[PDB]
């Protein structure tokens, strides 16, 4: 057989329909992520992404930070995660204000602003939830 | 239709011209035309193996037990005798070895010559003192009796070697 064929049946595009690139597994998995799922307000996409990435980020600072061996390691890790989240939201805001300048698909000034607000709220939620969970474990 | 073995056919290459030919070539090695053997090498090798085997039989008999030329003492079957003769007179045994080596080098050049052209026949060195080649019958009879009694030489020498080599 032949599992590698040109993407979109267009031989002259710089891509290939490999099992990793175009297979039911990957199409369904990526099509259900918040960044690409259908019927989601950009605020909800941002909220999902932030929740995923906030809970995810407390652990490294908590366990490998300079205060990891102190009895306040978890709080220092949470604060570091909060600071990094704030930095990333600053990055997102500036990227939105630079890229889309001349509610919808996520590629717009208002769409990206809502996505960033959702991302901040969700990231702080994820960090707080990770702290709550780790506080007693 | 082979005279020796009726159940397998005689080879096309063997026409009976060579002496001692009874059409006894099952594997059909005479048909070789690769790696440069081509049944003239085999004939030469047969004659040489057989002649040296006849000499080997006569030597192992050791009936006189005077060590051939005088000054060669003692009697032994094969290996100890060879080593002892080499030990007592290395000069003479080396001389014999080099005589054989010289005839071998000249013979190899002759083998190549015979390959290129038919001037040299297989087993032929023009060493005939009688110089009898006018009428075929006697030459053929002498040659084929040589080959037969030399084949017997080889089989007898195997009968010698087998003893003392087994478990």
């Amino acid at each position: 057989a032949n599992f590698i064929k040109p993407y979109n049946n267009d031989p002259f595009v710089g891509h290939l329909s490999t099992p990793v690139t175009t297979s039911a597994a990957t199409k369904a998995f990526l099509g259900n992520l918040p960044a690409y799922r259908a019927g989601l307000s950009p605020l909800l996409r941002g909220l999902e992404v932030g929740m995923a990435h906030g809970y995810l980020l407390v652990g490294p600072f908590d366990k490998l930070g300079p205060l990891r061996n102190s009895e306040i390691a978890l709080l220092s890790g949470f604060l570091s995660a909060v600071g990094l989240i704030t930095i990333l939201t600053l990055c997102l805001t500036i990227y939105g204000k630079v890229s889309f300048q001349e509610n919808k698909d996520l590629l717009t000034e208002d769409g990206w602003s809502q996505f960033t607000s959702g991302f901040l709220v969700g990231a702080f939620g994820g960090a707080g939830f990770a702290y709550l969970t780790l506080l007693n474990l | 239709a082979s005279k020796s073995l009726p159940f397998l056919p005689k080879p096309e290459k063997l026409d009976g011209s060579l002496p001692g030919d009874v059409g006894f070539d099952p594997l059909n090695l005479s048909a070789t035309d690769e790696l440069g053997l081509d049944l003239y090498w085999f004939r030469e090798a047969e004659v040489k193996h057989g002649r040296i085997a006849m000499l080997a039989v006569a030597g192992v008999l050791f009936c006189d037990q005077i060590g051939s030329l005088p000054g060669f003492p003692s009697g032994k079957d094969q290996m100890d005798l060879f080593w002892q003769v080499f030990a007592e007179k290395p000069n003479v045994v080396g001389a014999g070895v080099v005589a054989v080596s010289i005839l071998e080098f000249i013979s190899g050049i002759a083998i190549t010559a015979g390959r290129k052209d038919g001037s040299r026949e297989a087993g032929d060195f023009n060493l005939d003192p009688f110089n009898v080649r006018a009428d075929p019958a006697k030459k053929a009879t002498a040659q084929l009796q040589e080959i037969k009694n030399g084949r017997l030489a080889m089989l007898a020498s195997m009968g010698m070697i087998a003893q003392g080599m087994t478990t």
Partner: protein, 188 residues
């Protein structure tokens, strides 16, 4: 449908050779392999892609059966002869049991000599088998050794051949049983 009536007679098997009762319940002769590459492999230097018209499978199995049967007849008669005490001259063959005979002679050395002789004879036989695929008329087990000369009769030779096959199969079974039983218990 014969010697095993409730099964079709094997189509590959032909009821046209001595000792033919259509007995192949496992369809061994039905294998389409030609059994001649087994001696002269594959393309080989000595091969012209000849059709499997002779060696096929039944020719091979038939040569194998005849060889087994004659070897077994000789083996059983020899085993019986030795266990009666025919140790022959030499003073080294004497004092050995028939069970010990094989390994005793292998340690002796004559077994090696007869192995080399058997190598020569089986090389002759393999050359013969390769013949009749190159265009000879050899039949399975036919070495053309026939002093009795009954092939000219064309009918008595067939009866002799059939009797040979039957006596030889019986001899194979008898030798196998004799060997196993004699190993388990000693008797003449």
């Amino acid at each position: 449908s014969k010697s095993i009536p409730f099964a079709p007679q094997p189509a590959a098997l032909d009821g046209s050779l001595p000792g033919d009762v259509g007995f192949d319940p496992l369809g061994l002769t039905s294998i389409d392999f030609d059994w001649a590459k087994w001696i002269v492999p594959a393309r080989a230097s000595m091969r012209k892609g000849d059709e499997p018209v002779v060696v096929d499978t039944l020719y091979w199995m038939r040569e194998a059966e005849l060889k087994h049967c004659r070897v077994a007849m000789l083996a059983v008669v020899g085993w019986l002869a030795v266990d009666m005490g025919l140790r022959l001259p030499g003073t080294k063959y004497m004092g050995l049991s028939a069970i010990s005979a094989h390994d005793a002679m292998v340690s002796g050395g004559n077994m090696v000599v007869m192995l080399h002789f058997a190598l020569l004879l089986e090389l002759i036989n393999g050359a013969a088998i390769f013949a009749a695929a190159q265009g000879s008329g050899r039949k399975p087990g036919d070495f053309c050794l026939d002093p009795l000369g009954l092939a000219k009769d064309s009918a008595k030779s067939a009866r002799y051949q059939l009797s040979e096959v039957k006596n030889g199969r019986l001899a194979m079974l008898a030798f196998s049983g004799i060997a196993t039983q004699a190993v388990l218990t000693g008797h003449s």
